Amino acid sequence: IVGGQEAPRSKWPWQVSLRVHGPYWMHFCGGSLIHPQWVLTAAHCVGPDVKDLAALRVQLREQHLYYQDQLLPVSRIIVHPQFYTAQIGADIALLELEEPVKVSSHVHTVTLPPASETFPPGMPCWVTGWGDVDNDERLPPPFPLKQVKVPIMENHICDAKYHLGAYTGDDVRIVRDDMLCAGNTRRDSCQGDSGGPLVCKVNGTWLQAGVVSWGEGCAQPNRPGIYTRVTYYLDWIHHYVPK
Amino acid sequence: IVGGQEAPRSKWPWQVSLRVHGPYWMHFCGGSLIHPQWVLTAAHCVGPDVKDLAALRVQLREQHLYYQDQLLPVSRIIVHPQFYTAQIGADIALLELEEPVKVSSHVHTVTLPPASETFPPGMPCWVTGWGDVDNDERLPPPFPLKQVKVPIMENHICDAKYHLGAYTGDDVRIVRDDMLCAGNTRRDSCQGDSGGPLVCKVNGTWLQAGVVSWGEGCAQPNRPGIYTRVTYYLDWIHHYVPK
């Protein structure tokens, strides 16, 4: 996360950390608990090539990474079949936990938006995670969870911006219809935040509007952070996750 | 270049090296001379974002990198407007030199194939460059120009292979129509060879069938090297390069 601060212990109870086997269970991507037994994340974090379930673990909300770990095994990885690269789209995936987690006020699910829900440009939303605090700058120990308020940006405006200072023809889509943008030159997501949540509070109730997907650098001019638009893939999600 | 060997001094007179400014003019991509004033290369080597021309230089056929340099400045960089990523396609671009080069048996242009040439499996083709000799393994000094004969594979077969061991739906095409596959687990192109030529001997003449574009790793099982299919972009090239 770029341009944000450490999150209060009572904030973002649905945030999760994905760990990969190694000298130690290292954090490589974020995710969100959308059901007691299901985690939502980005496809590029666990694909497109098939990965060994035994080398993956999920860690529920932690104030500091690695300090009070309680790793959970994953029983199944479901990557959207239309996914190959983030730039092409469908950057979304599901992780079925071995056991349904025991929800508490400190750790619980985030609510998904209704199919008709559309987050307007400028609406203040939040992105969270343990990723880099700037281009090539790793989050330093003790690795606190970070948060940053970012305003939603209209898909068309975002697409236009990405063409600025680029050779790509203005008529050639870069930011596609299943993607959403947010952030600016001071606040953005970054490597390591991928798969994590972008939440906006509507009628009270926090709704997850997107999944951290990709971008060109972090907080770079005319290069807003790009997310997978959750509403676009609700049918696919609800094909595996109980409503 | 993975596998293969050092190229004879008389071979590949059209090979060029792209250099980026810094502590020394370092090689970052390949290319080919297709006209005394024009170099053909890959779009991902110079795009999708517009970079400063001043920071780019071209080196014509050299037996070893850096030892006998005579760097040439560029006046224009033109990238296919459809380009954004190599996985999507249109990974091709042109560089116009500030002056026409003098040709000879040691340095001259490569011939482009006629629109109808398909380059089927069994066709004798070679790829050349100063790229890595293996995954994560750079070409060691004195940096000789390497070459390797690679077997052509039909797009449909190649696409099927890229789906093996991947979550991507079988009907979601990975190897696209404007692309071409070549190589195996012993012969392939690698990082650093990008933008370089894949040439095939047809009826006694060398024709550039492709431009080193991308691939998953180098010489990895079920993951042959991918090239931009030159015949697919002949009309675009001819808008800029005199015949």
Next chain:
Amino acid sequence: IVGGQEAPRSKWPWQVSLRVHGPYWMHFCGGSLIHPQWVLTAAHCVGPDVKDLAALRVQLREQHLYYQDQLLPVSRIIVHPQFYTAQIGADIALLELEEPVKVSSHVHTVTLPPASETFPPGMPCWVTGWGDVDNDERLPPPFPLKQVKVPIMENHICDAKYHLGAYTGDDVRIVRDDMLCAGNTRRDSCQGDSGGPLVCKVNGTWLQAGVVSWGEGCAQPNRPGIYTRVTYYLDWIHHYVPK
């Protein structure tokens, strides 16, 4: 620390961590509390060249680095005037804190040995620190304080071993009189543990026999870890630290 394991919460109340300013206050050397206002460490950790005091801070006993930091500033750095390199000797230094610390069962001083104590082979001794767990292998997060029991080895025996597989003349002493050896191919100190304490339980009390100083690699055959022999520098220490 190579071998051994995570130290219990109640052990080594005198262990200290030296921090250098930068992206975060990073651990670079060990140390021990020998007086409410003084820390004993290795000269090579802070010398031979004079560095800015401001860029240094001390962290008293804590289970995991960076988690519960309470950094303490230093008013003075005193390095043995005979020091230039660890191999030559006199690798010992003192840090005076700006304020005396409050002691308790969880944080208190370690007892220095009587001038006559020799710490012969067979005596039970432990070395502690947050250093590498193996050659060029850092302690992974959450960075627990490690400990390991190491076997003492007589100086002359150690010296002979250091000559095995070396061009150095047998009569040219390598392990000097102001030094002490401990450890084997399974138990040893390593980079990052430097300045830390080697303590032995004598007549029911813990005495600091040495300070982690140097060695060829970590836990390498015929190359035991080398420590500064505390008894040799008691007079110097007592010139600054009161009883």
Next chain:
Amino acid sequence: IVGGQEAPRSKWPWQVSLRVHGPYWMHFCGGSLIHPQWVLTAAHCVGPDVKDLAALRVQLREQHLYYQDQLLPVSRIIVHPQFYTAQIGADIALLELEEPVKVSSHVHTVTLPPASETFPPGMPCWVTGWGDVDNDERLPPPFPLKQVKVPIMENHICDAKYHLGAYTGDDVRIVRDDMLCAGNTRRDSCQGDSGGPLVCKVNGTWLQAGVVSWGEGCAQPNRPGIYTRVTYYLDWIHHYVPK
């Protein structure tokens, strides 16, 4: 080499490059041809621990490293028995070649100074090599041999300088009597130049006064380059090398 330039092809015919087996025969230190079959170099380049001769090779004078290599096998490595570290002294060694070299005007031996020869403070001498051009700054391809004129510095003055800004007692020798210094904040030797020669033209002949040994940083204030004093070890040298 710091602050110098490319050496003319006709100069320094006695310069050699030591290579170590690996992906390629990489340069790791310099040396000088002092006899048709003997190379003089620094002990720390090949010691203190014994290494097998099979992984070592010698390359005679070439304008650019790796370009037109003609590697020579070594029959024996002789390290001074009093050597353990550069800071202690005796940093000198001999490499006996498998065959005597056929000297030419382009490649021949350098002359060793008489036992009584004393190089006065201020005398203009030269140090040559393929080492870093600045701290942590490697020599860029094509790796030309570099040279730099450095003035001799009186031993006492050099020792005094090394104490400035250090904790070491003024009466404790840092630069010893078997060592020699030269260079300033603009011109100096650096990592990779070790084992190489420092030659001074006395009257009308080039004499090798020193062997690049060590220092604190390169071209750093009050930290001139330190070399092993050749006249100090003339007897040891002539014990193996025919006069």
